[PDB]
Each structure stands twice: as structure tokens, then as C-alpha cells.
Design an enzyme around this catalytic site. Sequence first.
Site, mmCIF file in Angstrom:
data_model
loop_
_atom_site.group_PDB
_atom_site.id
_atom_site.type_symbol
_atom_site.label_atom_id
_atom_site.label_comp_id
_atom_site.label_asym_id
_atom_site.label_seq_id
_atom_site.Cartn_x
_atom_site.Cartn_y
_atom_site.Cartn_z
ATOM 1 N N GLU A 71 16.489 -16.677 21.890
ATOM 2 C CA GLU A 71 17.331 -15.715 22.595
ATOM 3 C C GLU A 71 18.233 -16.425 23.594
ATOM 4 O OE1 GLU A 71 15.198 -12.560 24.723
ATOM 5 O OE2 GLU A 71 17.144 -11.711 25.353
ATOM 6 N N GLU A 78 7.968 -4.261 25.661
ATOM 7 C CA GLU A 78 8.600 -5.474 25.152
ATOM 8 C C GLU A 78 7.834 -6.669 25.736
ATOM 9 O OE1 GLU A 78 13.221 -6.994 24.762
ATOM 10 O OE2 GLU A 78 12.456 -6.702 26.790
#
Lengths: 274, 190
Positions: free
Chosen positions: B177, B86
Site C-alpha cells: 500500500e 480493517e
Amino acid sequence: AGGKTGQVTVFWGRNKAEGSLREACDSGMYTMVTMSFLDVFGANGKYHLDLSGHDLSSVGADIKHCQSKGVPVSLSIGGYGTGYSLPSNRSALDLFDHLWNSYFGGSKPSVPRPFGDAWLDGVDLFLEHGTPADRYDVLALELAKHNIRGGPGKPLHLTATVRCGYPPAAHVGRALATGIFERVHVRTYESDKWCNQNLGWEGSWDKWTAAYPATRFYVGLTADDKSHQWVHPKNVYYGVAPVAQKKDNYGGIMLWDRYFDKQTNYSSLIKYYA
Amino acid sequence: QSITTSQTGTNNGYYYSFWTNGGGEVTYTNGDNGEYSVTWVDCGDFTSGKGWNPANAQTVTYSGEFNPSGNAYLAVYGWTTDPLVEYYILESYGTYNPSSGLTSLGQVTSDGGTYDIYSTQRVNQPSIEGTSTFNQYWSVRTEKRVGGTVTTANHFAAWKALGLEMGTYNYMIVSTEGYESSGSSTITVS
Ligand SMILES: *[C@@H]1O[C@H](CO)[C@@H](O)[C@H](O)[C@H]1NC(C)=O
Ligand SMILES: *[C@H]1O[C@H](CO)[C@@H](O)[C@H](O)[C@H]1NC(C)=O
């Protein structure tokens, strides 16, 4: 060493008079509520959810209300009865499918959804009874495929609630050997000789934590003040929580359960020590 | 029409991912020609944005407003597979550097303005593939910006120049986010 997490998991479902799932969540005392129990499952289409005459037509909206407020909800399977088994791989995939299409993200005409469009946040394995022929490893690996971040889904918190005794029964050990259990609640509050708060739990705790370093571990306590395994809040602050927080993979405290928590507000004091 | 739980798809020839763990009220909306918009209130964790699905190392052209009131990230965000990774190329953030207590590492120049490199292991964590153990890399900026160019080829090749493998590309979006915060964000990729 690594200590305080502020995490408190509470079980729910063992008596209607403990109040709804939404009432539990709004107490502001728990970071996770585990419903209890899916007490029947096996090598057939037979499944049963026991919530002890609990108001079913509340819990679905309460799941969603819980999630909005930051309290995820899981369903524990098994329990203290002998009405469940998972004696094959195919038995395990049927279990996944039922779980998934009843309470999680699946939707099939021929499978009802007791809690409506509410989508649960995890599964717990409370496996009092089993044999080496059980395939909870198959269930666990399938569930883990749906522990999703950054994709079409949501986290699934896969856990096991185990007896104090290490090493665990074969059917539990086999599942735990997959490696992908997020948390394990070790129950230290049972009358088990040689393994409870009065005698043995520190040693059990030492071996459990070392055997699964990639898994968080919750010390499991009773909120029934009349139990001999009950530990006064003073001794939790001073003894239980410090000892358990020695290990790097300490995750928090599990409390059995919401019914007995309403009787003594155990969590009020305990949540500050977790 | 707006959404509020996790889903992916295509919107005007752009891959979009919106994921949330269910915490708070997060509202996601797709606009035209690469825009998306998220408003959030006491969220738990969510990711959101547009990009490409089977994504090359795209030269990303983004712009807009990113107004968190609390902790949030605005990164060129993506994953690989085999091995699982990620990656964040953090352009801006709110009230907290996501590299808080990591062994400080750096640095790399790109598209004007410089960044910073970190790495850290996630163990038994959720991911695009389920419960996994993988590294999460970073390209933090010592100066914040909201809009500009991030040529992803340079960040990838600089991490791989040092001791950090990648894998096959799966998706890369410009992610807004939020983490236990409120706010609003309207970003437009090209
Ligand atoms: C527990 O606390 C709640 C409020 O926090 C109160 O309504 C309830 O009566 C208390 N019960 C006990 C056993 O003290
Ligand atoms: C279990 O058996 C199924 C067949 O139903 C098979 O496809 C699957 O790969 C098996 N799972 C594992 C890895 O044990």
C-alpha cells in the site's frame, strides 16, 4: 480544537470563459473541483447537465488528468433553478442509476457517457428548492454504498452545499439525518439577511458543526471581490479561518467559484490559510 | 497483462484485490503461483496483493522485495464484517510509522520476532461496504522484515484476548500500500 487542513474546494461550470476543468486543476490551487450543475432531474427519464456551454469534449480527459494530479472531481446536482425534484424513492434510485451509468462506474448501452471512461469522485447536493416529500436520503444512502476502499471501486465524496441558515430546509435535513455525509459546505457569501459574513455566520457555523460531529465542514466564501459578502484575505487569515478552525470537524474552505477565482486569484492567498 | 484502476478477481487460485483512488500512476501485475508486482509514481492511496477471498485464519507464507521511496506499508491486511473492521499486521514500512500519534499499546510474539498492538476509529470513511464508522487495528513490528511467516491465528486471538472484537472474515491479502509516494514491490504469497 483542530485547525488547518490545506483543503480548498472550488465549484466549476457556471461560465465557459472560466477555462477548462484541466486548467482549473493545474492551477495547483484546489484539492477538489465540483462541477456544476445537474440542473434537471425528477419523476421521469429527464436529466440535464448544465455546464454553461462548456467545452464538453475536454472535460472527460481532464477528469482523469485531475485525478492523476491528486485533485478529485465531483458533480453537484440541483442549483438555483426549480427544474428539479426527487419526490419519491424510485425517483432517487433512477437518479442514482443515471449518475452511476453516465459519470461513475456503470456501463449500459442505452445510457451515454458524456465524459467517456472517466469515473467521478463524488456527488454534491446543492438543493436550493425542495419539499419534505423529496427522498434525497435514498439517493445519499445508495451513493454511500459506492464510497469504496480496499475493493473494486473508488472513494465517493458525498457532500451538501447548503445555505448559511441553520436549521436547514426539510429536504436537506432529511438527507443529512442519514449521517453519512462526508462534508458540508456552508455558504456564507449570499445576501441572506441575518446569515452571511457581515452578520450571522459564526452562529450558524456553531450550530451546524455541533449537529453533525461525524461530518467535516467547509466554510463557503465568494471569490467575487465586488460582493458585499466578500472578505479581504487579511480578514480570512485573522478572523474567518481561525474562528472556523475552533471546531473539531473543520474540513476546509469552499470557494464559489472558478470563474471569479481567475478574476482575483483569491485562492492564491486563501490556500495557505485553509 | 497489467492494470491501472481498481479491480478484483482470481489468478492461479488466489484472490487478488487492487484498489486505487486514482492518484498518480499505479501499475499492478499478477504473476504465477501467488506473485504480484506494483510499481507506483506519486500515488494518492492504493492497496494491492494476493490472498484468499472467503479467507480462514490462514498461515501466511510470503517473500519478495518491498522498495518504497516514501510512505508505504507491507502488511498482512484484511477486513471483517459484523462488525466492520480493517486489520493490518505490518511487517515493514517506508519513511513513516503508520502508528505516529496513537496511544502506544502492545505487545505480541509470533513466528519469531515481536509486534505491537494499536486501535483507532475511522469515522465516515470509505471501506469495503461503503461509508462506515469502524475501528482499524494494527500489529506493527519494532524491527522491519520483508519475507517470513505470519500465522494470522495468533494475531487475531491476541486482539480478541484484549478489548477488540472481530467478525466474519471477508478477505486477507499481503498488501503493498502506497500513500503519496513512489516505489516498487514484488511479493509472493503461498
Ligand atoms: C492570476 O495568476 C495567474 C498565474 O498564477 C496569472 O496568469 C493571472 O494573470 C492572474 N490574474 C490576476 C487577476 O491577477
Ligand atoms: C426505497 O424503496 C425501494 C423500492 O424501490 C426499496 O427496495 C428500498 O429498500 C427503499 N430504501 C429505503 C431504505 O428507504
